[PDB]
A = this chain, B = another copy of it.
Amino acid sequence: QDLMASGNTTVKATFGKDSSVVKWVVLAEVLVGAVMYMMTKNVKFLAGFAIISVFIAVGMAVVGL
């Protein structure tokens, strides 16, 4: 017989690019990045404004159903 773990297309619409996961991972950097000027106050946490769209593309387009 066939498999029974899929056939509903539920996890794809929940954990994907066109869902809500991409919104909760884009504001997590500014939550600790724009407030750390009190302790460190340096130019170091600036390499995260480009790795958001790259990490989401190298993991979602692996299988693709």
Contacts and interface: CB of A to CB of B under 8 A. Distances in A.
Interface-central residue, A2, A16, A42, A65, by most chain B CB under 10 Å: A2
Interface residues of A, number: 57
Given A5-B19, A30-B56, A58-B8, A25 B35 contact: yes
A14 B50 contact: yes
A10 B3 CA distance: 7
Interface of A: 1-8, 10-16, 19-35, 37-39, 41-45, 47-50, 52-63, 65
Given A14-B50, A15-B31, A49-B59, 8 more contacts: A1-B53, A4-B52, A5-B14, A5-B19, A5-B21, A15-B50, A32-B39, A32-B47
